[PDB]
Symmetry: D2
């Protein structure tokens, strides 16, 4: 419970300042540093390597809690664990024995950059990275970037995906700072340009094309996608809960009745809260079960495609329900608050819809629906990829 | 749990064979009720020491949903047997449990149900007995019931009028008349018609607590206040079972019989219908499993706080709301994935799923379960314990 | 006014008996004869030819009124005008000069029997065709004075696979109406099969030339109006069922629903009636506008593909809204009426859902939606066919 | 009527060029308000004899929807000018109309609105003194006249009576506070107005104090004011909906990436456009019918309670459907456009949702629904008020 208490207190502090911060956009350095000081970036690192030795259920609940307060910080925090998951699933034990204590002592907050961007092999096993990555979540103030590139000028085969974990201030890396979005405004998800960037052999995650081989095999590293899509699910549930709580506080404190004596006794106000709160309870309860299954497979040495596909179907279902819920709720709750909630821009409630509306487009929910339908009707698991 | 769920799965399989003809006939599914007796599953919650299976609520709930997916009437009868058993177990004395539970095992009891302005009154008789009079309008599973769980309000009672008496009595006790007047849209084999009590004697050793004890237990939040969330989650599992049964039956039809408007199973909109409803079902089923585990956890406590009972009732009400909306939409809209021929032949019988769900979801109005969840979230008021919340 | 009063009085009588009649299925002969005596089957025949000289707006309103009382009779009545429309659009003036006065005198009620088609037309030396095969879903095929029949040419030196259409007596030698209709709803539409055993169709019964209907579809010319006309007939069946269900539910709520004050003052009951009645008003008002456009183009000597395509989009839109409305309200109105409305099978309210659920599947609303979307987004009109 | 609608269409075209930049700043769209002044359209309902255009309500409503599709704030200002004009026309004396209406033509009047906090106290010779602050005052900046409402106080002829007046906005003691800073509808200048000892003369009063209350409760002709005005709101919502749909479709055609060879051929993109375009077509066709009925009753000398009640039910129905439509469409169309539509804030598509989400809260749709349900179930027409 201690880690969840730390996340709850962080979220409490973030609520105080989110309204002003997200209007500005840009990098929430102070808040990222507060997360660094909290230790929670080490949740999944073993105690033996200096981390907290915690589980995915705890990580997911902390993501949802932080997201309920500040969706951009929730996303940054959550995608740090997506990046960490990728490293853990592909790095060697020797790499992790060095990286994880270093991540603990240096308080690493991981960012993401990932085809245009090429990896040219050099004779000593190094690579040179060139090109621009269009969207690069958490690419500012990042202690390391998880970078993906495709091999080029490669006598052993072009187009093979390489991944590496590299310093963000390595020569040739330019974080362009061009993120100016509807919502998720403080996730620094703009472009990063690589000009002759060197990647050393001991920074590489697996071999070229290994991620593609793991996807095609449905093996354990292909857990990365359900893990990450469930991170997104918890962002949407967190935003949903935060919006519901903020609306209810407004209804209790500011809404006027319309033969109604109190707005909090209005039958239609109560119906809106009841319908959305009910769907939220069921979605949150279902999501906890899936998070436990993530942890179970995370601990296995081997994962079959049937185990991975069943999990991906469960995650996709959770994401579909959470997507529909957060998008409806963040818009319709105005009907429970009244005109003054929109007449005063400064109240800032539209942040919840803007944040959810932006992030839920990451990959199309229509095709998560098709994937669940193709499984249920035709017994076909989703084809593993970076989105399914 | 594995053995009991296998037994329930095999029961459900047999029920699917005949449900089309039986539910059209209505009436009492006597043969299937006896099959349930033979299975031993009616004793799931009776301890092994008393002759039962010593199983848990999560097992009961999964078995309810599995049977309901095959035959909603038998799923309801089976599920409400456990609501009746829960009430008995929450109020019965050690002496009553020592007598009744071995007898329930040996006689294979299948429990049925008959319950200020109440029509059924209990008037005191000498020696601690009560006389029951009146007609109970809706009495779930009241036919072929080995014992009836009966409720009445005290009248002409020196110890206080208006108190709720509950008793467990033989259905063949003199003066009990099961009227057999159930003829419904769906849930057609649940025998949920009226029962008329004419001078029916109830003895002290049949009383479930003292008169009014249920009202005290519910107002105090003592352990019997778990009865309503337990029972409302039974209904939730009937709805999720019907939902799953309908989705699986439609999918088989789409695979084997639908024509494309290359193959219907590759149609983008057919796939979207199955994906939308299967996704909601997965989430609802996963949520329902968690709440079932909480039911068992609190069932095992000596004392449940009002906060714990209130939070459970909110979770159960939420599950029931989502399951109600899902089953009502899914059982109607899946025709759009199957095509016109699924309705052109009445005998296909797919409308049974909608009729069953549409009937049972009206048991108590979802609008007021929604208001209860809203009053909790907005105003921090837990629902007031009653027979419905 | 006069025709609509006649239809309203017909519907009143049908409501008295529909609950008992529809349970039995089979042919509602007495009600079909009442429609014959009413004169309304001649609504669109000019006064010159002995008909009423009325307009499609009147026909559509009459269809919806009858459907609100008895969906099977509404369908039978409405599809009579679909059959009539086909005849009017493809028959010669000489054919109509004979047929229409005959249809008036003899009180014709028209029925319907019709790639990989099961029913072939083999040419005979005189210009007749021999029809063979079994046609499924032959709406209104029983007690029909004439059948509109479609067949595909076979063993035809002038081209196989061409569609021929004809209007023939239902007792023509070799025609067997099979009576094999036992459906969820629309139970008295006699939509079973018709078997053609060496049925001779004579040259004066043929509608156009072989394949002319296909060429008219490909041209988007005036005869291709048949589809929007017919799809708007279906739309009015759905609106009529919706109105009938709403009024029947309201009668139950006023006389039978129990409260817990008064059920008719319950805020959630009122919300259900309000939401559906509002959508019904808007859908009905919109359908009247489309019906006026049907009449306008029906009176033109020539119709462009643009006029036809725009009409079909408007019809499809009306059908989409009406389909969603009727399917939702015929199920959800139980939530307003309460448990006793389902506990008493004899109330029979499920007839509305059964009728709507059956008929709305005639062709998939998902593709009507796609057709409207393809027009709005890509400016493509639907490809004319028997369904679009 | 083509000329006036052509003028409105050209105005709307010009507004679309600049709305994205203008609405960001908020404040008063003076240049565009003056463009509307020069157009003559503010005189649509003034007779030609008095220098107006002698046009009808259907033209007004079509113009409102067209302008709203380009700029929701200008559509609202324009529409509410006609609500204000309708109120004046329904209560003004023959003397007042003879003077005001030629003056409104000559001086190109754009009418604003201010309406308890605001009292009217008797002054000598039949004048009143207005004191208090009006909370929301639609179009209160750059207004040639304000329609002002107050409640009599210290009045020997009766306290608590509603007085209305049409006064200059620069009358001594009128302070337009300029405090409108809203989520959407950002250029409607709907902030507060403070009245300090403001004199209102008898020839500025719109009927006697309390007359509006009698006129509404009796169902005399001024009881048309509310359905007229609620239908103006309905056309704002339909205009926003059409504008959003057309803007999204332009983006989908030119910018959306396929997930599928072209986004415009994606089955789920097409389904989104088809669902919303279908509902929009039906709602717009329905709204034309109700607008015609407004005109018909506007021309009547006496309107019965059943005629007014039926009209209000039809208007409330249209508003309910338009409200649900625009709120869903302006959010869900992002799912047809893709992530880049939200990633680039400058696209500015969220303006449609912000505008619609703000204005649809003017009065609660739940009680419009209840009013329609109370009519349909209980045969009770809505009680006339400023909202029903």
């Amino acid at each position: 419970h201690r880690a969840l208490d730390v996340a709850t207190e962080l979220a409490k502090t973030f609520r105080v300042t989110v309204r002003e911060r997200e209007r500005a956009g840009g990098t929430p350095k102070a808040e990222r540093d507060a997360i660094r000081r909290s230790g929670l970036l080490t949740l999944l690192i073993s105690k033996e390597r200096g981390g907290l030795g915690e589980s995915w259920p705890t990580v997911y609940e902390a993501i949802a809690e932080i997201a309920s307060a500040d969706a951009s910080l929730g996303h940054l925090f959550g995608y740090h664990f997506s990046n960490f998951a990728y490293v853990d699933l592909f790095a060697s034990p020797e790499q992790k024995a060095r990286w994880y204590p270093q991540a603990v002592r240096e308080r690493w907050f991981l960012g993401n950059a990932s085809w245009r961007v090429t990896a040219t092999p050099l004779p000593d096993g190094s690579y040179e990275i060139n090109g621009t990555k269009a969207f690069c979540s958490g690419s500012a103030d990042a202690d390391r970037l998880l970078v993906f590139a495709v091999t080029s000028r490669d006598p052993n085969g072009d187009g093979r995906i390489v991944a590496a974990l590299i310093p963000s201030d390595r020569a040739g890396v330019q974080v362009n700072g061009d993120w100016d979005s509807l919502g998720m405004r403080q996730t620094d998800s703009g472009s990063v340009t690589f000009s002759g960037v060197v990647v050393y052999p001991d920074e590489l995650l697996g071999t070229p094309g290994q991620v593609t081989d793991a996807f095609a095999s449905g093996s354990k590293p292909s857990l990365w996608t359900p893990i990450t899509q469930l991170i997104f699910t918890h962002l949407y549930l967190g935003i949903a809960r935060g919006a519901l709580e903020e609306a209810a506080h407004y209804s209790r404190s500011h809404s006027r009745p319309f033969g109604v004596e109190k707005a909090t006794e209005d039958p239609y106000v109560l119906a809106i809260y009841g319908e959305f709160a009910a769907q939220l309870q069921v979605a949150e309860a279902g999501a906890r079960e899936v998070a436990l299954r993530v942890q179970e497979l995370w601990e296995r040495n081997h994962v079959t495609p049937e185990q991975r596909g069943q999990l991906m179907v469960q995650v996709a279902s959770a994401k579909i329900v959470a997507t529909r819920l957060v998008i409806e709720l963040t818009s319709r709750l105005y009907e429970a608050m009244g005109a003054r909630a929109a007449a005063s821009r400064q109240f800032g409630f539209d942040r919840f819809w803007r944040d959810a509306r932006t992030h839920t487009l990451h990959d199309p929910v229509a095709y998560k629906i098709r994937e669940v339908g193709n499984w249920f009707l035709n017994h076909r698991f989703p084809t593993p990829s970076f989105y399914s």
